[PDB]
Design a protein around this ligand. Sequence first.
Ligand SMILES: Cc1nc(N)sc1-c1nccn1C
Length: 330
Amino acid sequence: STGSATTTPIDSLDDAYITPVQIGTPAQTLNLDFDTGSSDLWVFSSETTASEVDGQTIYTPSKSTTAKLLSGATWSISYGDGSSSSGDVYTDTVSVGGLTVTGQAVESAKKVSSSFTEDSTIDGLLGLAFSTLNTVSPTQQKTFFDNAKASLDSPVFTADLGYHAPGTYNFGFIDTTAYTGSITYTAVSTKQGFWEWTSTGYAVGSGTFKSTSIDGIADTGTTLLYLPATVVSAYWAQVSGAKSSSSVGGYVFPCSATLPSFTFGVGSARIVIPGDYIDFGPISTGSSSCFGGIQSSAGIGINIFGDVALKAAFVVFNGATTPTLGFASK
Ligand SMILES: Cc1nc(N)sc1-c1nccn1C
């Protein structure tokens, strides 16, 4: 089997991407944030504290003839930005782009933090990291991909995120029309539960490539590109007036700037992030100070190849017996 679904930016800055997901019988369609940096499929629901729902579409398990409470199971998760959610668990039928899993754990939120309530466009998350990170207790649950994998034509999914435009998540096949050139595959460590790999270096604009190993994770659920402070300083030094602002929480730059591109290495191959992709717009409405899309990972504890990087590539998440990651230009 295969599946194919369109993923759409939630706003004009590509702050996140939402993909429609069918849950239950009859189908209830929710728009979920596909997150290769976590491993829980959770939804706003009829169980979510009413004051914490503000415009999201909810899953109502009592209206699904295939829903079953997973008795005794609870979940609780917190993300790198400090947001969080928690609740109980149902199993139900979940379909993405025509690919169906029966018995998928659907984690129903009883509580969500303010940043979830405040984002009316995101109805929940669909985790695509390794199932070892799933938070359900006392019986850990499998991700949608883990449950689907044996049925897929090939044990892969691909992320093809757009810059200020829709893109595609495919399951079970590699669309050879969706990228240019060849796909370069690179090793993955699953030891921390992530799609963790090592970039071979970087360049800023038209500058020379610096060969240096940069461990990090391929994370569709993180907006920006978080890299070591040395690398990030080298980038922003090429932008007149750019500075790290403790009050804003990262590098800012004059909105009048033309940002340089940023290149990262995948083996001997190179992925070029256009300067436009690094612009996250005014820090507050009407400001002439703009927020940068490349930020320091110092104090995160891991480098993160988030959407800023991934949207410049066609990315293969290869779930073969030994997982790997593939990157192609597009
Ligand atoms: C700040 C910026 N740097 C580029 N290379 S294009 C660009 C920009 N200004 C306004 C919108 N966008 C995308």
